[PDB]
Amino acid sequence: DDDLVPPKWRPLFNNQDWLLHDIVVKSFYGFGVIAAIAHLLVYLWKPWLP
Amino acid sequence: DDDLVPPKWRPLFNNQDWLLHDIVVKSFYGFGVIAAIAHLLVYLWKPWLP
Amino acid sequence: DDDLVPPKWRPLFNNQDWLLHDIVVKSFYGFGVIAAIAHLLVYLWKPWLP
Amino acid sequence: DDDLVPPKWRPLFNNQDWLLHDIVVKSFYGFGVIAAIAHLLVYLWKPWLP
Amino acid sequence: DDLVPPKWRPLFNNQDWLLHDIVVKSFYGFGVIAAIAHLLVYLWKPWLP
Amino acid sequence: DDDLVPPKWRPLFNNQDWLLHDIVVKSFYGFGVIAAIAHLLVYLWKPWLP
Amino acid sequence: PKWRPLFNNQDWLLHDIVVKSFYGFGVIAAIAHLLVYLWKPWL
Amino acid sequence: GEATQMIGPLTPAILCWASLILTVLGLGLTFLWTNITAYARRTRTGRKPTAGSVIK
Amino acid sequence: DLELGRDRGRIGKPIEIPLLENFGFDSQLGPFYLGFWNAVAYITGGIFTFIWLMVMFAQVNYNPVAFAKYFVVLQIDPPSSRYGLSFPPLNEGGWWLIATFFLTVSIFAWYMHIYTRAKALGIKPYLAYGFTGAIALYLVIYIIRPVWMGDWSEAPAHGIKALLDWTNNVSVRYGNFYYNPFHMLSIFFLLGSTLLLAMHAGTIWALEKYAAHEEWNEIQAPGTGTERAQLFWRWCMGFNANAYSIHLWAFWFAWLCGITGALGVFFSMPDFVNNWFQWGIEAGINYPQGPTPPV
Amino acid sequence: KAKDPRFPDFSFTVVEGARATRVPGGRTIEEIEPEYKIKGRTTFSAIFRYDPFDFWVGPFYVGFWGFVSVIGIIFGSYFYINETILKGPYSIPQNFFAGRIDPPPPELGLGFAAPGEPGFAWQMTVLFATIAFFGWMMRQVDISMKLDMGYHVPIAFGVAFSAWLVLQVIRPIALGMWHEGFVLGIMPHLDWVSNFGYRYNNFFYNPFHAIGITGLFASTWLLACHGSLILSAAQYRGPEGGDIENVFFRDVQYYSVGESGVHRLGYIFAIGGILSADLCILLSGWPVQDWVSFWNFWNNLPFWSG
Amino acid sequence: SPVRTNIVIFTILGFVVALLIHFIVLSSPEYNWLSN
Amino acid sequence: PVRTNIVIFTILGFVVALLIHFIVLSSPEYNWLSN
Amino acid sequence: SPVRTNIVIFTILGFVVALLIHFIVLSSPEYNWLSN
Amino acid sequence: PRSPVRTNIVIFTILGFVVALLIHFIVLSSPEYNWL
Amino acid sequence: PRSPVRTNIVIFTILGFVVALLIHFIVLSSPEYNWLSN
Amino acid sequence: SPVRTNIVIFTILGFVVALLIHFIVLSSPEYNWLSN
Amino acid sequence: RSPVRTNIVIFTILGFVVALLIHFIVLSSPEYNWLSNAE
Amino acid sequence: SDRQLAIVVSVAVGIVVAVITTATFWWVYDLTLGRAQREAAQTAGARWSPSDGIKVITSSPPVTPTDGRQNWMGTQAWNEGVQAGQAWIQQYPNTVNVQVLIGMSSAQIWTYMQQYVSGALGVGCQYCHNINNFASDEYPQKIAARNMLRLVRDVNAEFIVNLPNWQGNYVQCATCHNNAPNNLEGFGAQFINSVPPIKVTVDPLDANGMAILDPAQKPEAIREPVLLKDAILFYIYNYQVWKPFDPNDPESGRGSLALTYDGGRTQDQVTINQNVMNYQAWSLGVGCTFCHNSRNFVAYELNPAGDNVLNPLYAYNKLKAQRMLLLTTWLAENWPRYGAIAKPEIPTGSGAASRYSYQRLGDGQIYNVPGCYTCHQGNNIPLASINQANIPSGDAGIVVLPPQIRG
Ligand code: HEM
Ligand SMILES: CC(C)=CCC/C(C)=C/C=C/C(C)=C/C=C/C(C)=C/C=C/C=C(C)/C=C/C=C(C)/C=C/C1=C(C)CCCC1(C)C
Numbered sequence A, B, C, D, F: 001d002d003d004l005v006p007p008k009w010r011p012l013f014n015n016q017d018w019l020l021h022d023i024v025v026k027s028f029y030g031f032g033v034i035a036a037i038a039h040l041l042v043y044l045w046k047p048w049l050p
Numbered sequence E: 001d002d003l004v005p006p007k008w009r010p011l012f013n014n015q016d017w018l019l020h021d022i023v024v025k026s027f028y029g030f031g032v033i034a035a036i037a038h039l040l041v042y043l044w045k046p047w048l049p
Numbered sequence G: 001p002k003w004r005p006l007f008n009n010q011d012w013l014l015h016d017i018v019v020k021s022f023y024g025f026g027v028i029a030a031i032a033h034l035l036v037y038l039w040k041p042w043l
Numbered sequence H: 001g002e003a004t005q006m007i008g009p010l011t012p013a014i015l016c017w018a019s020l021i022l023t024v025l026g027l028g029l030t031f032l033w034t035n036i037t038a039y040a041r042r043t044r045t046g047r048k049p050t051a052g053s054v055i056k
Numbered sequence I: 001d002l003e004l005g006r007d008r009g010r011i012g013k014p015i016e017i018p019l020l021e022n023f024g025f026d027s028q029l030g031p032f033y034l035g036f037w038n039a040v041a042y043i044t045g046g047i048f049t050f051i052w053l054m055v056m057f058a059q060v061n062y063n064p065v066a067f068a069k070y071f072v073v074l075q076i077d078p079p080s081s082r083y084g085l086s087f088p089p090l091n092e093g094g095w096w097l098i099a100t101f102f103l104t105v106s107i108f109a110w111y112m113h114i115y116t117r118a119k120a121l122g123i124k125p126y127l128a129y130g131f132t133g134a135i136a137l138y139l140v141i142y143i144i145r146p147v148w149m150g151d152w153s154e155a156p157a158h159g160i161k162a163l164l165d166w167t168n169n170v171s172v173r174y175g176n177f178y179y180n181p182f183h184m185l186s187i188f189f190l191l192g193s194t195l196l197l198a199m200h201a202g203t204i205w206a207l208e209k210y211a212a213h214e215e216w217n218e219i220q221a222p223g224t225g226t227e228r229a230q231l232f233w234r235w236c237m238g239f240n241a242n243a244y245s246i247h248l249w250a251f252w253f254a255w256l257c258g259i260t261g262a263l264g265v266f267f268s269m270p271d272f273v274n275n276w277f278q279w280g281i282e283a284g285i286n287y288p289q290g291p292t293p294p295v
Numbered sequence J: 001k002a003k004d005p006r007f008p009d010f011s012f013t014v015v016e017g018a019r020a021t022r023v024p025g026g027r028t029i030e031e032i033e034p035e036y037k038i039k040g041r042t043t044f045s046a047i048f049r050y051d052p053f054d055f056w057v058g059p060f061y062v063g064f065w066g067f068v069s070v071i072g073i074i075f076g077s078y079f080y081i082n083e084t085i086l087k088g089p090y091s092i093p094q095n096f097f098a099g100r101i102d103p104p105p106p107e108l109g110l111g112f113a114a115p116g117e118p119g120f121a122w123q124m125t126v127l128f129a130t131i132a133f134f135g136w137m138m139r140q141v142d143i144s145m146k147l148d149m150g151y152h153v154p155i156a157f158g159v160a161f162s163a164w165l166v167l168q169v170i171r172p173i174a175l176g177m178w179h180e181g182f183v184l185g186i187m188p189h190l191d192w193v194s195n196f197g198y199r200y201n202n203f204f205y206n207p208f209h210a211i212g213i214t215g216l217f218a219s220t221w222l223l224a225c226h227g228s229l230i231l232s233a234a235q236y237r238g239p240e241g242g243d244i245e246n247v248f249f250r251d252v253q254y255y256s257v258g259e260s261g262v263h264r265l266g267y268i269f270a271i272g273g274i275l276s277a278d279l280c281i282l283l284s285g286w287p288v289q290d291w292v293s294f295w296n297f298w299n300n301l302p303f304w305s306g
Numbered sequence K, M, P: 001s002p003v004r005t006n007i008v009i010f011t012i013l014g015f016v017v018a019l020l021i022h023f024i025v026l027s028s029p030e031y032n033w034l035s036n
Numbered sequence L: 001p002v003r004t005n006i007v008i009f010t011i012l013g014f015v016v017a018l019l020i021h022f023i024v025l026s027s028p029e030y031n032w033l034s035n
Numbered sequence N: 001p002r003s004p005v006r007t008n009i010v011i012f013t014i015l016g017f018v019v020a021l022l023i024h025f026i027v028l029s030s031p032e033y034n035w036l
Numbered sequence O: 001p002r003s004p005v006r007t008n009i010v011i012f013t014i015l016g017f018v019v020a021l022l023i024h025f026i027v028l029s030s031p032e033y034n035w036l037s038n
Numbered sequence Q: 001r002s003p004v005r006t007n008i009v010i011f012t013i014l015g016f017v018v019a020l021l022i023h024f025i026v027l028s029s030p031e032y033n034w035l036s037n038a039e
Numbered sequence R: 001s002d003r004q005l006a007i008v009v010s011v012a013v014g015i016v017v018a019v020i021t022t023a024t025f026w027w028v029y030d031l032t033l034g035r036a037q038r039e040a041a042q043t044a045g046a047r048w049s050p051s052d053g054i055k056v057i058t059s060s061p062p063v064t065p066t067d068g069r070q071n072w073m074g075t076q077a078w079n080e081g082v083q084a085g086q087a088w089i090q091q092y093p094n095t096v097n098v099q100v101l102i103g104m105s106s107a108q109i110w111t112y113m114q115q116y117v118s119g120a121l122g123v124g125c126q127y128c129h130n131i132n133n134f135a136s137d138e139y140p141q142k143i144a145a146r147n148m149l150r151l152v153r154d155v156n157a158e159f160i161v162n163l164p165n166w167q168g169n170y171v172q173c174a175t176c177h178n179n180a181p182n183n184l185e186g187f188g189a190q191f192i193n194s195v196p197p198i199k200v201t202v203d204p205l206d207a208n209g210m211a212i213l214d215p216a217q218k219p220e221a222i223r224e225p226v227l228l229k230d231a232i233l234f235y236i237y238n239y240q241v242w243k244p245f246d247p248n249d250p251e252s253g254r255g256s257l258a259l260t261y262d263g264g265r266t267q268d269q270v271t272i273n274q275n276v277m278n279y280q281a282w283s284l285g286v287g288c289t290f291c292h293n294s295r296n297f298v299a300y301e302l303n304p305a306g307d308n309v310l311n312p313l314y315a316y317n318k319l320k321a322q323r324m325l326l327l328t329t330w331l332a333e334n335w336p337r338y339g340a341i342a343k344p345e346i347p348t349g350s351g352a353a354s355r356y357s358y359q360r361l362g363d364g365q366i367y368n369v370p371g372c373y374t375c376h377q378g379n380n381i382p383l384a385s386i387n388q389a390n391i392p393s394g395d396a397g398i399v400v401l402p403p404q405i406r407g
């Protein structure tokens, strides 16, 4: 069943779980990059730190 | 028991559970536009971040 | 048992739950227009938003 | 043995359930008819709305 | 059924050893970033001297 | 099995608890060295013992 | 392996861990008390 | 007597004494009933079960 | 009794933790049963919890650290005595009223849930009949006494420290609640219930070896285990109570505490009794007070 | 059934065959009683080989400790009645509620009074009542070893005896005066329970008192639920005999603690609350004299300053 | 079909709603007709 | 699949209506039972 | 079978989060819409 | 089911929402940053 | 190769987060370091 | 023999005694590196 | 065997508790206070 | 007697080790804390002596006034102030500007002032006087001291010498200052750190004894929901008695804080009342049974039954508390007259007093009014109050406490 998984993460990830780890990793950066943009915007409103 | 789901998501879920996981995505997209249009009216009413 | 219900909504339904469930949309919408009229009359009585 | 139940809502009902449901319909509608007179009498005694 | 270090055979299999590796690497990534933060806040406003 | 555990302590230990307790002991002694450094460096700041 | 039917060679090891610790405890504690009371004594 | 704090037609002393007497009497009666029907009873009529063991 | 669900109202599969068996507790967390009544109870309880937590949180200006610090002493106040039974503006009693209504609906929905579920499985609904006592106490304290006197202000505030404050305030305002004929009976029943649980649990734990904890099999067939409890108590005090009688005692001692004490709370108002110490003076149970200062 | 091999047992065993001695209708008192009248196994018959006290005078087992408790009961009850009901403010029926016995005066400290001094009655009554309670304790211990049972009932009665011992001995001993006990007399003891605790500024803000209140309320709730379950399921005869109770709670409360588990939980619920109440009384007055301002340390904790 | 269960639940909901509405209307400080 | 979701829905439709009605009634000007 | 329980928790999370900021905005006197 | 990753993911996600809520509330209670 | 590396790991992550939480909260409660009080 | 649980008690005891010592040292007016 | 394992844990607990309490008592004394003295 | 003797040997050993460890712990306590606690305890409970203020006067850094006065703190300033007093009493043996202390010689004025006006406030001669010309009033502090000397006479004669079971204690200048010139503390740390931050509505009592429910008929400060502390302050500074104490009936002596009577308030007001009584308990350092009996809080017992948890002097303490609640409402009413300097804004920073000792009085001005803790400070008998048995009879007693301000 485990086909598209990397060869090292065979004991841990089959196809089902690895395809979920992929989307979670991507979304982390889809909940990453957005949060950094937000903080940059809030920083140049009133800086909390010197 | 599926013959409509896209090839890459076949091993995960069948027709039954992905048909309603198109209803929920249609709700989310549209729930978003209503939220955006509603938000803009309030932001014109009184801005909360200057 | 499964004819009046569609040709797409079939793993998720059968005849009885399709009826029993089609009644709900007609109630929903009809309430909804009644509530829209009530909201209109109440807002005419006094506006809560400029 | 459901000759009294119309073909329309046959699978969801039988004779006794339909007989009870007809009574419930008449009861609720007469209930509303009495409600109309009650709210009319109240409004021509102490109008809460304009 | 494990190709783990000849020493830590009794406790580690490849799966658990791989798990332990990730958190090991994560801890030292935590360390350098925490050192950066501590050094930065120390230059901003010393506390201990 | 008990091949690593030294012969004196056969009764209580097995092979893996020896390794666990050994890493615990090494951690304890490294902890002691670092704590001694911290205590000495603190004593030169504000002595608490004349 | 001990002519002591109360322990066994096992639980007469565990016990012995506790019997040392006390000897080091006494020496270090006596040194600490002497050092402390040599700087602000009592009656 | 004119008792200011009355609970209906009940004087305070009557209420206290009645409460105490009723509690003691009920406790004694329930103790007797419970001790009598503890074990199976054997008489000339029959062998009555202990308390509730014949689902009837 | 709509029961929703997939398999006779139960959703999911059992979860088994073998560790609990060691301490003597059952190892299964079963399938969850979702019915109409328990769904209503859960929804209304969630709404009540949200209202309570958010009205408390708004008072500390949404400070999580201040919320954690002052959580115990924070409270939601009922309508003041001026409004009587009317609906005041929010943040001064409307929030209390809405939360109280939803809590009452949650309690009633839970009572219906247990009554329906007992009936469905074939056993008698004696758990709901016993819950009626706690329901009566809650109903009296929160609605019946305040609605009778026409002041929402005599019902407890919605806080952890607020319940203790309300207990002290009611005892002080109506004159030393220790002189309450029904709160005396309530204390008797509550302390007796605790004593009863102590002796019964200690007996069953001691007789665990003789399978005396299998009470269902010993009601119909006592066996040596039940006998070595009956004889124990007969030799201790001169009377015993087989498996059925003792559970009747437990149920009745627990239920009577609610009723005798709901009566006590109800009667503690200016219409019936205003001074419980004056009540005791008129009952002659007080040790005599003494002379007034000369002046 | 799945008893977790990698952890210590802590669970019951069911000895050999105490499952087939179940008569389907119940035995009478006639056959049961002679079965387990073994002559021996007393916390006196073991030390001193051969003891008596005309054992079993009716339903009751006399025992050496029963004799000790009878002596204590007789003397303590004589003293308590003679200066509570016999000598009091009003008539004897009314004196039952209002009679009192007061502790010795402060300047006595820790010391005996004289036969007639104000406080001799309290001292003698508490001493003889303590002796009677100890006798009851050891009689319960004796009856348990008679029938080969656990000592859980003696242990819980010991927890209650510990509450009494704390209140009437330990706090007076720790504070240096016998003038720290509680008044004997039903309404006077209520008055004392009020005044004590109000003199410490709203005893409700005592942590251990709150724990004891929680234990009491939870024990009553558990008693109600357990009695209701057994009463409801006693009449059921169907597919699942005893599990009809487990499945019912799993539908209601999604754990359903077992049959032995509920009894163990009730034991802990009953004893822990009273132990916490003992701690609350012990700490009341010795370290701290104000319970409202005792929480002053809560404001100055490092993470709460703003 | 749970026609009986729905009927009973519907009637109980009606009773509860009527009771609550009567309580709220009568307790309001405009409609309590206790001025006679 | 859908019967449960209908009942749950409904009892939400009810709880939310109750909540909004109470909040509307508690507001001073919007109180239609005080005049 | 595939996990499809996220849909239910996600709808509940949406309801809770929407009800949260519909309460916080009410608490603010300036952003109130229910005074007049 | 070779790893509990499908349930660990939900724990991490619920960790995210709680931390976001806490930080949002802390910033909202700041007199400096009150936007409502 | 059986022993609870995973159990120790999942308890080694909660403890660090709890410690950091507390450590951050104390430094924010100090008037001389609190950034959101200028 | 329990070696796998005596090093769990060891670690918790050390952590708790470190917590207490740091707290006590931080509370002293002469030893306070934050509020100074 | 008979119990010596309970004694080992009880003795350690008692020693730790007594040492902690005695330290606290010494620290609370004005003269022996070492982390509060100024001059 | 088999090998199971091991458990009883273990029990005996664990009992012996418990006995020896408890005995050694108490020996250590006696050797370190029991000794340190007893010297510290001796300091508490001692009366206030004029040397206490002289010590703080002479062991304080010199300060530089900005309002045109010499340094009044320090040993040198004290020395020259005393020397100038000697010179002045040498010049004029008869006073020339006294208006309150009429009938005193200049030597007794010098002696009384350098002790009980200097140590009492902990300030030297230079605070209110001009060293070169003593009799001249140049600074407002001297006018304030004159009016506040009048306050001592008025307060003593109107409230203190009238108290049932008086014990003998007068109020001197140190009783509320407590060697502090300005910014005195009116509420202790227990009050500020022990009163929860909640908003309550308070219903005051009407002259007949009934409650006033509509806000429009209420005093100004309580027409809105207020904090518990502010309602406590209102009750303290707005106390009246609607049922004067008649010994002939035991339900008399009810004031603004009466709850359990026929008219009666609701359960809500009990929280506010009990918090006011908690403040009173904290101010005196006593419990609730110092004046009350928990069986009923209304009674004036005189001779209570259960003495171990009660105060035998129950009713006298209750009546004294009533009279001083009236006193700390009379003070709020008449504070502007008795020479108190009005504060612009409530002081903040270092030197301020808790923000609750500062009040806005009738003439829209902020004053530092006294409270229950001001004169008590945790002691049921103020340690800075003077007993009549400690006052010498006659010529020497004129120096200690003037008969002019004795009442
Ligand atoms: C914290 C413990 C206290 C409690 C719980 C408490 C409780 C009460 C209560 C309930 C009342 C109103 C009772 C009424 O109906 O007559 C009251 C009034 C009173 N209390 Fe307290 N009290 C406490 C402490 C004190 C103390 C220490 C004093 C004395 C210094 C005191 C003096 C008074 C007085 C004089 C009244 C009468 C006030 C009035 O008539 O207006 N109380 N107390
Ligand atoms: C001064 C000036 C000039 C201006 C002042 C500015 C101001 C104060 C105004 C602010 C206005 C605001 C804030 C308006 C907000 C309107 C909203 C949120 C509408 C939502 C509608 C949601 C709707 C219709 C939702 C419909 C949902 C439907 C039909 C769902 C159907 C379904 C369901 C539920 C189940 C499954 C089947 C199906 C998909 C058919």
Ligand SMILES: CC(C)=CCC\C(C)=C/C=C\C(C)=C\C=C\C(C)=C\C=C\C=C(C)\C=C\C=C(C)\C=C\C1=C(C)CCCC1(C)C
Pocket: E019, E022, E023, E026, E027, E030, N008, O009, O010, O012, O013, O015, O016, O017, O019, O022, O023, O026, P015, P018, P019, P020, P022, P023, P026
């Ligand atoms: C405050 C005062 C006043 C004095 C000081 C107070 C005091 C009492 C003590 C001082 C210090 C301490 C006790 C520092 C201790 C720190 C630790 C142990 C942190 C956790 C770390 C490790 C971390 C976050 C790294 C973790 C694991 C990660 C990141 C992810 C892990 C994994 C798990 C969940 C399985 C699935 C995925 C994967 C395998 C990757």
Ligand SMILES: CC(C)=CCC\C(C)=C/C=C\C(C)=C\C=C\C(C)=C\C=C\C=C(C)\C=C\C=C(C)\C=C\C1=C(C)CCCC1(C)C
Pocket: G014, G015, G017, G018, G021, G022, G025, P006, Q008, Q011, Q012, Q014, Q015, Q016, Q018, R020, R021, R024
């Ligand atoms: C002048 C003479 C002139 C006398 C004057 C008055 C006086 C000096 C004394 C009076 C009393 C005493 C004797 C106080 C002594 C106290 C205590 C209770 C100590 C703590 C102990 C425990 C100690 C030290 C060692 C403890 C615990 C250990 C080693 C735990 C051990 C163990 C674990 C946990 C389980 C198994 C494995 C292992 C052996 C590692």
Ligand SMILES: [Mn+2]
Pocket: I204, I215, J226, J230
């Ligand atoms: Mn049972």
